[PDB]
């Protein structure tokens, strides 16, 4: 969906779109999608653009441009969501968390997890590293 | 390129090329412009070009670029190939390999107690150290070069009565010295540097405050494998003229250090001030049993450890010998020609002390077993201190093991009785680790920074010797006692119940295929004085040992996502 | 490289013990004669160099009976060649 | 071997494919496997 | 010609219990000592596959599906025994009454063994050397034992028997036998025998990579015993004919035909 982004990327993206829009229609050419992304720091090579128009005629409207930035931002955020989700598990932050620490903080997180689900969770996997916890979460 | 051509173009085009020269040799037209050249040596030669450079291009500016990247790529690659082969020193021997060890050693100098960037080169040198430790030696004099910085290093102790030369330059030094073992060249001016280091370090333990490190103090023992001034009259100063059977070596302290140790053992010596020098040099007194066959002075080797055991029998305190216990490695070599057939008192010294330790542990275990008055304040008293006795217990057990690895033949043969006392008192872990003592089981630090690790593993070596003096005929009741102990009948509360078990029954199979040998190997006694006790010995003992070897030895995709 | 099949046939005369060998119907120069009371088993030794190598052919010529009927006396009369299951090769 | 001293980039392929250099322990005592030639 | 292995007859197969036997060597040649499954195929060095678990004390090697470094070489005497316990499926070796540690130190590293069809004691001998088995028919002659054995639950192989145990060995002398129809690369079959041609037998091969072959000295299963068309001549004749046909792709230079 598009609720993954806050207000403040969307108000910035309409700021970039209405700056380089042609006549206020909400239209840009297949050149201007390149210059509107390099105006904000993001510098993709032309294969990254090459698939998104094939994904969406020559008329790139503002809901089409908003959906392409949402997929361009969510893939790196879905790859990096899980490390900061791992940070409250260990006290130091290198990735090493105790097994005795993990049965009161993971049964109390608010998804109605009982004592039985985290007991199945850790014995289908001392202290375990960080990259194994992605290996055991995504499965 | 041509070197990477296929087998088809490397057999026919060469034929198209080899025969042309053969045509040239027709009518006398000669035009000229499996020797082990060794690509490995060529790689070393390719390294030599880098070795001939190195300090020629870097130290010419470092001691006064993109080229400073090859050292961070070749040095890492040298740590593998040298450790990968480790068998080149067997067939095609070449001294060219030994050259690079010294050619880099000069480059590893500059600041042999500081330097910069990486220190992994010292570890890389340790890898090449294993490769080394007729021609053999030639233009090098590395040992002579080793005597350079090591000389004033003796004054470094007097300069605080050089900071990494006793670390980095002493790493490969203590390594290659202790890594020698196999081969042995000679001893040209090595004893000169040794005596300049030995006698210097023999009195360097007197300087208080800064006692430096005891690591290099074990390096003297590591180098104690060369050959034969404290008293070197016709060996040091008065020997610049030009090595047979000169009956004089460590005889300057042959009986002297023996009497010194005997007096040191006679005294309490229960302090860090005690030994001190001996605590950092008398570990090299055991290396003298090398060239002297096994032990010509057998009684000396049968007392030096006993007197050393007396120092251990003196018993340390809290911390005390926390780091002063790593010398047990050398202790696992003094038991080589251990002709300690005497033992007895020394056996009792290993028994009564352990029994005293068992009493001390019982004084601590029962202080934890009979203290459940709801108070976690005893965790500092009952526990914690248990680790102090635990680490102490993990010192004598590492010595009695090798002792029992030779005193089992004649011990199990002929008779017994002697080791029977040890077996009856070997219920240490049985009255601790097997007695549900979680605190004693809580080695933790002892289990980590000091499963299967001693404690009860040592009992397995004598478990057979324990059952050896057991039933020389009818067992049976032991199985009933095993079931009795399984029902948890205390201890002596089962023996009385075991006292009422009819009698021993055996008159069928086996027996003559078992007790026949026992009726010719025993020849001791037979009465009702035994009853349980001897039967109640290994009964409850192997019972818990069996328990130690018994049982002791979904939320789907979309919901995973929420928890993530 | 021969594209044809060399067929070798042998001839053993029991009442004389005389053994001869024919090569494609052309008699070879060699011959063999043995003791009276002796036995013999037919033999082929080969180092193979093909997917299909040899093929034991139990046949008769124009006026002589085949092997079949002379190895075992239930039929030492009927001239028709036979291949009973007892005939097996050995390695 | 090639450029053993050029790209001083710490994050270059040199520090990445450094393990590829160690991948040559397959050759035993083939120090005398061939002569010496190039381009 | 190379080795002369020895075993026990395959009706003393053991499928449950704890047993023991020792080996005695004089020289220090090449000896193979261990246990073996009853289907021991000769002409194959033992320990190269799953058929036999064996230890070689010449170079400190144990062989099963290939060699592995284990233990120290021999000296003179070489009093070695073989432990066995099917309850935990583990095999242990002892030298001079002392168990041999593994590379890192363990119980002979031979674990997780299936019962199958039991196991039999096996022993080989290299050229010139001499071995002396001891199956334990008595007790006194068994030299060390005592220190290992009694106080862990072990009994000798022939604890109670009234006669020596018979044994077998490989002969060497080749003998003819029918071809097994599971021979990797050899296939034989009958052809029927029609009007146009009398019956025959013939061969095949797997001419490719993997492996090769030598000279297959083949022969038929028979014994023609030397004596002591017109219907007249064919019922009185004593001379009979057989025939072979070398097919194409086979050289008659490497073909020998006749009688044996």
XYZ file of C-alpha atoms in Angstrom, chain B residues 13-525:
513
model
C 50.887 -26.451 -32.423
C 53.899 -27.439 -30.309
C 54.397 -30.289 -32.773
C 54.011 -27.663 -35.502
C 56.700 -25.753 -33.556
C 59.023 -28.489 -32.256
C 59.581 -30.003 -35.708
C 60.549 -26.647 -37.239
C 63.621 -26.450 -34.999
C 64.354 -30.046 -35.991
C 64.275 -28.885 -39.610
C 66.642 -26.070 -38.621
C 69.152 -28.609 -37.298
C 69.082 -30.166 -40.766
C 72.126 -29.022 -42.770
C 73.662 -27.469 -39.651
C 71.505 -24.377 -39.037
C 71.475 -24.103 -35.238
C 70.105 -20.903 -33.681
C 70.210 -20.636 -29.881
C 69.954 -17.516 -27.729
C 63.685 -30.946 -15.663
C 65.824 -28.767 -13.397
C 63.907 -28.024 -10.200
C 63.812 -24.247 -10.636
C 60.750 -24.481 -8.381
C 57.803 -22.157 -8.995
C 57.466 -22.138 -5.210
C 60.997 -20.759 -5.051
C 60.115 -18.604 -8.054
C 57.161 -17.385 -6.011
C 59.710 -16.827 -3.262
C 61.869 -15.190 -5.931
C 58.829 -13.125 -6.879
C 58.588 -12.465 -3.154
C 62.340 -11.834 -3.072
C 61.891 -8.937 -5.495
C 59.325 -7.641 -3.014
C 61.617 -8.639 -0.145
C 64.641 -6.940 -1.714
C 62.405 -3.892 -2.008
C 60.066 -3.609 0.995
C 62.329 -1.646 3.336
C 64.192 -0.325 0.297
C 61.153 1.677 -0.821
C 59.041 1.980 2.332
C 61.565 2.244 5.179
C 63.523 4.649 2.973
C 60.562 6.975 3.492
C 58.933 5.481 6.591
C 62.090 5.975 8.649
C 62.665 9.264 6.831
C 51.581 5.521 -2.015
C 49.631 2.720 -3.701
C 52.625 0.438 -3.149
C 51.555 0.148 0.492
C 48.745 -2.224 -0.488
C 50.689 -5.238 -1.753
C 51.871 -5.838 1.809
C 48.217 -6.024 2.847
C 47.592 -8.725 0.247
C 50.745 -10.848 0.042
C 51.302 -11.156 3.794
C 47.780 -12.521 4.200
C 48.367 -15.012 1.387
C 51.597 -16.214 2.996
C 49.729 -17.305 6.125
C 47.883 -19.953 4.120
C 50.321 -21.598 1.686
C 52.955 -22.041 4.395
C 50.348 -23.615 6.672
C 48.727 -25.486 3.786
C 51.782 -27.466 2.702
C 53.768 -27.955 5.926
C 55.423 -30.956 4.282
C 57.876 -29.274 1.918
C 60.489 -29.949 4.589
C 60.856 -33.623 3.667
C 61.825 -34.052 0.010
C 63.039 -31.225 -2.236
C 64.773 -29.277 0.532
C 65.908 -25.757 -0.335
C 67.563 -23.208 1.951
C 65.929 -20.492 -0.162
C 62.855 -20.833 2.052
C 64.922 -20.214 5.183
C 66.308 -17.070 3.558
C 62.897 -15.401 3.317
C 62.409 -16.095 7.023
C 65.530 -14.062 7.774
C 65.131 -11.642 4.863
C 61.786 -10.640 6.360
C 63.177 -10.809 9.897
C 65.451 -7.883 9.055
C 62.418 -6.075 7.656
C 60.482 -7.088 10.764
C 63.160 -5.362 12.831
C 63.355 -1.558 12.575
C 61.365 -1.233 15.788
C 61.285 -4.765 17.218
C 59.298 -3.438 20.182
C 56.925 -0.956 18.546
C 56.541 -0.640 14.758
C 53.143 0.376 13.373
C 50.182 -0.544 11.149
C 49.805 -4.310 11.562
C 51.177 -6.766 14.119
C 49.855 -9.795 12.239
C 53.271 -10.100 10.598
C 54.467 -11.411 13.958
C 51.749 -14.055 13.732
C 52.713 -14.604 10.099
C 56.259 -15.139 11.346
C 54.916 -17.678 13.834
C 53.449 -19.592 10.897
C 56.794 -19.647 9.098
C 58.395 -20.563 12.422
C 56.862 -24.031 12.201
C 58.469 -24.560 8.791
C 61.938 -24.352 10.339
C 61.422 -25.453 13.937
C 75.366 -30.496 5.327
C 74.836 -26.789 4.656
C 71.809 -26.196 6.906
C 73.019 -22.808 8.152
C 75.273 -20.228 6.489
C 75.160 -16.449 6.072
C 72.654 -15.566 8.790
C 73.857 -15.236 12.395
C 70.264 -14.591 13.456
C 71.074 -16.065 16.864
C 73.951 -13.596 17.063
C 71.493 -10.919 15.964
C 69.112 -12.225 18.622
C 71.747 -11.552 21.279
C 71.728 -7.866 20.331
C 68.479 -6.422 21.687
C 68.141 -9.257 24.207
C 71.332 -8.135 25.953
C 70.160 -4.678 27.034
C 66.744 -6.255 27.623
C 68.287 -7.703 30.780
C 69.001 -4.147 31.904
C 65.370 -3.297 31.164
C 64.508 -5.042 34.427
C 67.094 -2.784 36.053
C 65.583 0.095 34.085
C 62.416 -0.359 36.141
C 63.656 -1.964 39.355
C 62.068 -2.315 25.413
C 58.388 -3.005 26.086
C 57.264 -5.207 23.198
C 60.586 -6.902 22.465
C 59.617 -9.112 25.389
C 56.344 -9.667 23.542
C 56.796 -9.658 19.763
C 60.511 -10.455 19.600
C 59.981 -12.993 22.383
C 56.989 -14.588 20.659
C 58.829 -16.258 17.780
C 61.831 -16.593 20.090
C 59.996 -18.717 22.656
C 58.161 -20.403 19.791
C 61.076 -21.544 17.614
C 62.983 -22.517 20.760
C 60.130 -24.729 21.947
C 59.334 -25.711 18.359
C 62.844 -27.092 17.823
C 62.437 -30.457 19.572
C 63.012 -32.612 16.483
C 66.147 -31.313 14.756
C 69.146 -29.762 16.511
C 71.984 -27.953 14.733
C 74.522 -26.933 17.379
C 75.277 -24.257 19.981
C 77.680 -21.602 18.694
C 77.688 -18.583 21.034
C 74.081 -19.451 21.888
C 74.934 -20.331 25.486
C 76.776 -17.011 25.629
C 73.527 -15.158 24.966
C 71.678 -17.723 27.072
C 73.897 -17.276 30.133
C 73.618 -13.531 29.550
C 69.862 -14.069 29.719
C 69.586 -16.958 32.185
C 71.701 -15.545 35.018
C 70.180 -12.143 34.284
C 66.672 -13.573 34.611
C 67.730 -15.862 37.460
C 68.003 -12.733 39.605
C 65.466 -10.579 37.757
C 62.727 -11.920 40.033
C 64.186 -9.989 42.967
C 63.140 -6.625 41.531
C 59.775 -5.849 43.133
C 57.115 -3.372 41.974
C 57.602 -4.110 38.273
C 58.079 -7.878 38.019
C 57.330 -7.658 34.283
C 55.948 -10.806 32.652
C 56.448 -14.471 33.538
C 55.796 -15.532 29.944
C 59.416 -15.077 28.871
C 60.318 -16.696 32.186
C 58.941 -19.880 30.645
C 60.874 -19.167 27.448
C 64.088 -20.150 29.220
C 62.535 -23.582 29.691
C 61.320 -23.469 26.096
C 64.915 -22.943 24.975
C 66.166 -25.524 27.474
C 66.937 -28.113 24.794
C 70.195 -26.886 23.258
C 73.099 -28.492 25.116
C 74.831 -28.547 28.503
C 78.272 -16.793 34.270
C 76.873 -18.478 37.379
C 79.913 -20.756 37.559
C 80.939 -21.131 33.917
C 84.684 -20.785 34.453
C 85.895 -23.065 31.660
C 82.833 -22.389 29.511
C 82.234 -18.632 29.365
C 84.907 -15.988 29.980
C 87.883 -18.358 30.047
C 86.998 -20.023 26.739
C 87.902 -17.673 23.882
C 90.585 -20.006 22.534
C 88.379 -22.310 20.460
C 83.286 -29.342 23.820
C 83.731 -33.003 24.753
C 82.682 -34.591 28.048
C 83.237 -31.570 30.290
C 81.589 -32.865 33.471
C 80.052 -29.471 34.271
C 76.755 -27.905 33.189
C 73.829 -27.319 35.534
C 76.011 -28.776 38.284
C 76.285 -25.269 39.731
C 72.882 -26.019 41.239
C 72.780 -29.817 40.974
C 72.518 -30.465 44.705
C 72.407 -26.758 45.542
C 69.020 -26.064 43.956
C 68.032 -29.520 45.185
C 68.927 -28.498 48.733
C 67.408 -25.084 48.041
C 64.140 -26.663 46.922
C 64.285 -29.138 49.812
C 64.701 -26.187 52.172
C 62.034 -24.255 50.277
C 59.789 -27.292 50.657
C 60.824 -27.658 54.301
C 59.688 -24.089 54.915
C 56.012 -23.170 54.565
C 56.593 -21.137 51.393
C 52.876 -20.323 51.288
C 53.341 -16.876 49.753
C 54.041 -15.104 46.462
C 57.374 -14.011 47.927
C 58.233 -17.702 48.132
C 59.657 -19.398 45.032
C 59.289 -16.207 42.963
C 62.452 -16.945 41.003
C 61.629 -20.642 41.292
C 58.054 -19.773 40.336
C 59.545 -18.393 37.120
C 62.624 -20.572 36.551
C 62.358 -23.856 38.480
C 59.938 -24.977 35.772
C 63.061 -25.254 33.627
C 64.589 -27.601 36.199
C 62.491 -30.410 34.724
C 63.845 -29.901 31.204
C 67.175 -31.247 32.466
C 65.687 -34.747 32.306
C 66.036 -34.630 28.520
C 69.644 -35.429 27.611
C 70.019 -37.296 30.908
C 68.124 -40.256 29.420
C 65.093 -40.851 31.624
C 66.503 -39.915 35.026
C 69.913 -41.120 36.217
C 69.109 -39.372 39.480
C 65.779 -41.199 39.668
C 65.202 -40.238 43.303
C 65.682 -36.598 42.317
C 62.917 -36.876 39.724
C 60.881 -38.787 42.307
C 61.188 -35.952 44.824
C 61.369 -32.743 42.781
C 57.704 -33.204 41.909
C 56.938 -34.376 45.445
C 58.560 -31.236 46.842
C 56.669 -29.279 44.196
C 53.549 -31.095 45.361
C 54.382 -29.951 48.890
C 54.171 -26.397 47.564
C 50.752 -27.385 46.244
C 50.103 -29.201 49.520
C 50.781 -25.876 51.224
C 47.433 -24.802 49.723
C 46.898 -21.321 48.293
C 44.301 -18.766 49.390
C 41.564 -16.850 47.565
C 43.185 -15.472 44.420
C 46.814 -16.287 45.254
C 48.004 -18.688 42.557
C 45.346 -17.594 40.064
C 47.873 -17.250 37.248
C 50.471 -19.277 39.142
C 49.082 -22.631 38.011
C 49.827 -22.609 34.284
C 53.069 -24.444 35.050
C 51.048 -27.657 35.271
C 51.854 -28.213 31.596
C 55.470 -28.955 32.503
C 54.184 -31.055 35.400
C 52.604 -33.339 32.800
C 56.115 -34.275 31.683
C 57.859 -34.889 35.000
C 55.667 -37.972 35.364
C 57.357 -39.540 32.332
C 59.931 -41.678 34.129
C 57.853 -41.383 37.298
C 59.248 -44.384 39.156
C 57.140 -43.352 42.145
C 56.633 -46.957 43.240
C 57.118 -45.537 46.724
C 54.080 -43.239 46.829
C 52.465 -44.412 50.079
C 52.878 -41.125 51.936
C 52.993 -39.320 48.595
C 49.939 -41.371 47.654
C 48.428 -40.326 50.977
C 49.600 -36.789 50.222
C 47.389 -37.014 47.145
C 44.706 -38.822 49.141
C 44.576 -37.226 52.600
C 44.745 -33.754 51.050
C 41.884 -34.639 48.719
C 40.133 -36.177 51.719
C 40.810 -32.909 53.529
C 39.535 -31.175 50.404
C 36.545 -33.516 50.436
C 36.045 -32.580 54.083
C 36.470 -28.919 53.151
C 34.015 -29.321 50.281
C 31.654 -31.136 52.639
C 32.124 -28.236 55.051
C 30.988 -25.997 52.193
C 28.407 -28.255 50.538
C 26.619 -29.099 53.790
C 26.833 -25.389 54.590
C 24.750 -24.952 51.441
C 22.696 -28.133 51.754
C 21.659 -27.444 55.349
C 20.944 -23.757 54.771
C 17.510 -23.263 53.215
C 16.240 -20.577 55.590
C 15.100 -18.347 52.706
C 18.128 -16.074 52.314
C 19.982 -15.174 49.116
C 22.755 -13.652 51.234
C 24.323 -17.104 51.537
C 24.934 -17.045 47.776
C 28.098 -15.071 48.515
C 29.046 -17.444 51.333
C 27.834 -20.905 50.297
C 28.386 -20.357 46.576
C 31.083 -18.143 45.014
C 33.636 -19.538 47.483
C 32.818 -22.955 46.017
C 34.559 -21.835 42.826
C 37.711 -21.185 44.854
C 37.931 -24.818 45.945
C 36.749 -25.929 42.506
C 39.646 -24.275 40.679
C 41.919 -25.726 43.354
C 40.463 -29.175 42.698
C 41.097 -28.736 38.972
C 44.839 -28.715 39.664
C 45.643 -31.954 41.485
C 43.327 -33.983 39.250
C 45.380 -33.003 36.200
C 48.406 -34.609 37.848
C 46.931 -37.815 39.265
C 45.601 -38.767 35.825
C 49.005 -39.347 34.238
C 50.044 -40.914 37.543
C 47.294 -43.511 37.159
C 48.264 -44.002 33.514
C 51.222 -46.085 34.683
C 50.212 -47.275 38.144
C 47.467 -49.556 36.837
C 49.372 -52.601 35.589
C 50.950 -53.912 38.795
C 48.175 -52.185 40.745
C 45.404 -54.265 39.170
C 47.669 -57.311 39.089
C 48.955 -59.306 42.076
C 46.737 -57.667 44.696
C 45.288 -54.247 45.536
C 44.585 -52.606 48.921
C 46.875 -49.660 48.101
C 44.693 -47.993 45.467
C 41.600 -49.207 47.325
C 41.935 -46.193 49.616
C 41.852 -43.848 46.626
C 38.782 -45.566 45.179
C 36.929 -45.349 48.492
C 37.757 -41.643 48.660
C 37.138 -40.963 44.970
C 33.513 -40.155 45.790
C 34.290 -36.439 45.550
C 31.963 -35.599 42.662
C 29.707 -38.371 43.956
C 29.331 -36.222 47.066
C 29.102 -33.098 44.915
C 28.563 -33.078 41.142
C 26.508 -36.260 41.458
C 25.014 -35.200 44.791
C 22.776 -32.629 43.073
C 25.138 -29.845 44.148
C 24.184 -27.238 41.556
C 26.750 -24.872 43.076
C 29.542 -27.417 42.638
C 28.040 -28.122 39.227
C 28.090 -24.365 38.661
C 31.699 -24.389 37.486
C 30.637 -21.615 35.103
C 33.890 -19.658 35.047
C 35.670 -22.892 35.934
C 33.737 -24.461 33.067
C 34.611 -21.538 30.795
C 37.775 -19.588 31.607
C 38.814 -22.202 34.193
C 29.833 -31.844 29.243
C 32.980 -33.942 29.652
C 35.846 -32.402 31.626
C 37.552 -34.242 34.505
C 35.627 -34.297 37.802
C 33.961 -37.652 37.126
C 35.963 -38.439 33.989
C 38.933 -39.316 36.198
C 36.824 -41.833 38.117
C 36.261 -43.785 34.903
C 39.973 -44.601 34.710
C 39.845 -46.334 38.095
C 36.217 -47.484 37.975
C 37.452 -50.825 36.666
C 40.029 -50.985 39.459
C 37.230 -50.238 41.920
C 35.096 -53.143 40.717
C 38.237 -55.269 40.429
C 38.323 -55.857 44.184
C 34.544 -56.250 44.280
C 32.691 -59.538 43.810
C 35.188 -62.278 42.956
C 32.228 -64.604 42.437
C 28.553 -63.776 42.939
C 27.455 -60.212 42.220
C 23.664 -60.238 41.799
C 22.961 -58.276 44.998
C 24.677 -55.272 43.413
C 21.819 -55.134 40.907
C 19.325 -55.284 43.770
C 21.305 -52.542 45.503
C 21.240 -50.536 42.277
C 17.452 -50.794 42.335
C 17.487 -49.955 46.040
C 19.594 -46.831 45.531
C 17.295 -45.990 42.623
C 14.470 -45.849 45.160
C 16.537 -43.307 47.118
C 17.207 -45.085 50.414
C 19.660 -42.524 51.822
C 22.970 -44.350 52.269
C 23.428 -46.486 55.381
C 19.641 -46.809 55.502
C 19.929 -49.185 52.550
C 22.896 -51.180 53.856
C 20.782 -52.405 56.766
C 18.163 -53.415 54.208
C 20.951 -54.924 52.119
C 22.125 -56.786 55.219
C 18.850 -58.697 54.972
C 19.156 -60.224 51.500
C 19.444 -63.980 52.113
C 22.863 -64.736 50.625
C 24.963 -64.646 47.459
C 23.663 -67.177 44.931
C 25.758 -68.567 42.073
C 25.762 -72.154 40.795
C 25.086 -72.326 37.051
C 26.438 -70.625 33.925
C 29.514 -68.375 33.998
C 31.101 -68.638 37.462
C 33.664 -71.208 36.318
C 34.012 -69.005 33.239
C 34.724 -66.024 35.484
C 35.275 -66.725 39.187
C 37.727 -69.504 38.312
C 40.326 -66.838 37.566
C 39.201 -64.887 40.626
C 39.712 -68.012 42.732
C 43.365 -67.959 41.676
C 44.071 -64.224 41.559
C 42.461 -63.184 44.845
C 43.736 -65.388 47.688
C 42.865 -62.941 50.467
C 39.915 -63.627 52.774
